[PDB]
Structures are given as structure tokens and as C-alpha cells.
């Protein structure tokens, strides 16, 4: 019958839950345009700092059989650029836009949010605040909530135990404006060593870098589901290890409303969204689901 990947959240309609993960294929105008032109339900701009950053020396990203490792160092065009893209360029008629923000301090986030406010108001761009200790997180969210008169989401690093799921959820649940939680950012500071070259594969930080892709899917599912459970009032956006509609299906089963695609998108480019939508639809059709609502968060436990 009639299947739909439509997602409705944040006062928006998304054609499908897919979007790039922040930082992937979303740094330049060209990329943002490509993402916007893609079949993705949405996009998020590269996490921005107040000013442009060159980011780290290359190689700073490496695709791997099981994912990716990167230490990009937040190369980005700077907030004004993404603000301007959101304010003046982005075609919201095509899809909603998220703007990822990653100030290097609370003050930077506060100042960016102060300015993002009007554009969020005028254009509907949605903040994904990159949060990737808990007191600091609470302070950050307080400071941002103080100056930012809109719902926003937060991009979380993965956590690895319930104590942390609980503590993080507790924080986030303090902030009604935090309407979505994106789980997860990279698994931090993995170290890929190329057995052939007997070396690391990225240059910054002695080769340590965030892992994405296949490596991170169960972690991502865990986090998605953990926050899905602990933040019942909030939306969870999944991010981590999505290469296929089936992976996305897992994200949604774990609780994801939107499903972000990082490494796989980096490796395939924006055409991946046509394939993901089609695959997820295929998965849904095989499983006799018509909407994401029908199985979102419905992963069955055995206990």
C-alpha cells in the first residue's frame, strides 16, 4: 500500500528522515546546494565556529572498510557563512535546514545563537548544537536557552553506560528547548593503523580520530535508544553507521526520527539519499510498515 518516509517534527515536514551528518558534505556552498538538491529529507550545515577554520592538516579523514576515521579539526567557513546560507540562500521550499554550531566555548555558542535567532525566526533554520562534562553541558544549554528563542537539537557524543545515558538525559531533559538529540557523534579517538604502512592513517593527533561508519552502529543504536527511552519528550536523530536503508531502519527502530548519514555519504556522495530512501522503503515494504511512526522506537527487547 501507501508507504511514506515522511517525518513531521519541529514544525516541519520532512520527505524522509535522511540527512547528512553534520560535517559531511555540508561545508561549502556547493555541498550545501548538493545536499539540498539531493533526495535527503534534510541537511545540516558543517558545524561552525564564529570564524572560519582551516581545520587540521591532512590527511585528516580516511575511509575504511568498516567506516572512517577523521580528525578534521572543525574546518568550516565560519558562522557568518552558514548563517548567510540559512538566511539568504537555502531553498526551504526544498527541505528544512539544520545549522550545526560548534563554538569553541559557551560564549561563542551564545554569540552565534544570538545572531542565529532572527534567522531561525525568519527562515526556519534549525539549530543543531554540537555538544560533542555534564555541568558544562548544563551551563551551555542554559546559556544557549537564555539567548536562543527556538527549539534546537544537540549533537551528542556517544556514551557507553547507563550512568552516562541517565546523566546526559537528565541534563537534556532540563531543557525543553532541546527538542531533538542527535546520537551520535563519532566514537572518539580511535586509532587506525595501516598494517601495510605500519602507520596511522590520519595526520593530526598522532593518528587518533573519531570513528564513524560500520564501527559505530551499535553504539549509535544504543545511544539513540538510550535517549529515546530517557528523553521521551524529545526527538532523537540517529547518526552513526548508516549505509543502507536497513541500517536506517535500525536507527528508527531504536528511536530515530531523522537519520543522519556521515561516513557512507562521504564515501558515496549525495546520491546515497535516493538509494537510502529506496532501501528504507524496500525494508518497510518487506516488513509491512507504511510509516516510520509504526516502528520508531519499537525495537523489541527480550527482557
Ligand X SMILES: Cc1cc2nc3c(=O)[nH]c(=O)nc-3n(C[C@H](O)[C@H](O)[C@H](O)COP(=O)(O)O)c2cc1C
Do the beta carbons of residue 9 and residue 61 sit within 8 Å?
no
Return the one option of its own copies, ligand X, none that residue 206 interacts with (CB less than 5 to 8 A, by type): its own copies
| Rounded-to-integer distance, Cα 9 and Cα 249, Å | 18
Q: Does 243 bind its own copies (CB under 8 A)?
A: no
Among 34, 125, 221, 242, contact with its own copies (rule: CB under 8 A): 221
Among 177, 208, 278, 282, contact with its own copies (rule: CB under 8 A): 208
Do the beta carbons of residue 160 and residue 219 sit within 8 Å?
yes
| Rounded-to-integer distance, Cα 108 and Cα 102, Å | 8
| Rounded-to-integer distance, Cα 101 and Cα 139, Å | 16
Written as one string, the DSSP assignment of 254-278 is: HTEEEEEE-HHHHHH-TTHHHHHHH
Q: CB atoms < 10 A from the CB of 169, how many?
A: 22
Q: Is 184 annotated as a binding residue?
A: yes
In the bound state with its own copies, the residue whose beta carbon lies nearer, of 114 and 298, is 298
Binding map of its own copies across residues 273-292, x = CB under 8 A, - = no contact: ----------x---x-----
Return the one option of ligand X, its own copies, none that residue 254 interacts with (CB less than 5 to 8 A, by type): its own copies
Q: How far is the CB of 67 from its own copies (least distance, A)?
A: 8
Instruction: Burial-class residue 287 by CB neighbours within 10 Å (0-12, 13-18, 19+).
Output: exposed
Binding map of its own copies across residues 62-101, x = CB under 8 A, - = no contact: ----x--x--------------------------------
Q: Which stretch binds its own copies (CB under 8 A): 34-42, 82-90, 115-123, 151-159?
A: 151-159
Q: Is 72 annotated as a binding residue?
A: yes
| Rounded-to-integer distance, Cα 107 and Cα 90, Å | 27
Peptide bond into 184 cis (omega under 30): yes
Q: Does 207 bind its own copies (CB under 8 A)?
A: yes
Instruction: Burial-class residue 3 by CB neighbours within 10 Å (0-12, 13-18, 19+).
Output: middle
Q: Does 162 bind its own copies (CB under 8 A)?
A: yes
Among 85, 215, 227, 273, contact with its own copies (rule: CB under 8 A): 215
Closest CA to 215 of 68, 62, 23, 18: 68
Burial 184-222 (b: 16+ CB within 10 A, else e): bbbbeebebeeeeeeebbbebeebbbbbbbbbbbebbbb
Interface residues toward ligand X, by CB under 6 A: 21-24, 46-47, 61, 68, 70, 72, 100, 102, 130, 132, 155, 184-186, 212-213, 216, 239-242, 261-264, 266
In the bound state with its own copies, the residue whose beta carbon lies nearer, of 103 and 157, is 157
Q: Is 224 annotated as a binding residue?
A: no
* Residues in touch with its own copies (CB under 8 A): 57, 59, 66, 69, 157-162, 165, 187-193, 195, 197-208, 211, 214-215, 218-219, 221-222, 225-226, 229, 246, 249-250, 253-254, 283, 287, 295, 298-303
Amino acid at each position: 500500500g501507501s508507504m511514506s518516509l515522511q517525518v513531521n517534527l519541529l514544525n516541519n515536514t520532512f520527505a524522509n528522515p535522511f540527512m547528512n551528518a553534520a560535517g559531511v558534505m555540508c561545508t561549502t556552498t556547493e555541498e550545501l546546494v548538493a545536499m539540498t538538491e539531493s533526495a535527503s529529507g534534510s541537511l545540516v550545515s558543517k558545524s561552525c565556529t564564529p570564524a572560519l577554520r582551516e581545520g587540521n592538516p591532512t590527511p585528516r579523514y580516511q575511509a575504511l572498510p568498516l567506516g572512517s576515521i577523521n580528525s578534521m579539526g572543525l574546518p568550516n567557513n565560519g558562522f557568518d557563512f552558514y548563517l548567510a546560507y540559512a538566511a539568504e540562500q537555502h531553498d526551504y521550499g526544498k527541505k528544512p535546514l539544520f545549522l550545526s554550531m560548534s563554538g569553541l566555548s559557551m560564549r561563542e555558542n551564545v554569540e552565534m545563537c544570538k545572531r542565529l535567532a532572527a534567522v531561525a525566526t525568519e527562515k526556519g533554520v534549525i539549530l543543531e548544537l554540537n555538544l560533542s562534562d555534564f555541568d558544562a553541558m548544563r551551563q551551555c544549554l542554559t546559556a544557549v536557552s537564555e539567548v536562543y528563542p527556538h527549539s534546537f537539537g544537540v549533537k551528542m557524543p556517544p556514551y557507553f553506560d547507563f550512568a552516562h545515558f541517565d546523566a546526559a538525559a537528565e541534563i537534556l531533559n532540563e531543557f525543553p528547548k532541546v527538542q531533538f538529540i542527535t546520537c551520535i557523534n563519532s566514537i572518539g579517538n580511535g586509532l587506525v593503523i595501516d598494517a601495510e604502512t605500519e602507520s596511522v592513517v590520519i595526520k593530526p593527533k598522532q593518528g587518533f580520530g573519531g570513528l564513524g561508519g560500520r564501527y559505530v552502529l551499535p553504539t549509535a543504536l544504543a545511544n539513540i535508544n538510550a535517549f529515546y527511552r530517557r528523553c521521551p519528550g524529545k526527538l532523537i536523530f540517529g547518526c552513526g553507521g548508516v549505509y543502507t536503508g536497513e541500517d536506517a531502519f535500525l536507527h528508527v527502530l531504536a528511536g530515530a526520527s531523522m537519520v543522519q548519514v556521515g561516513t557512507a555519504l562521504q564515501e558515496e556522495g549525495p546520491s546515497i539519499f535516493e538509494r537510502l530512501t529506496s532501501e528504507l522503503l524496500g525494508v518497510m515494504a518487506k516488513k509491512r510498515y507504511q510509516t516510520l511512526d509504526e516502528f520508531r522506537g519499537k525495537v523489541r527487547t527480550l527482557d
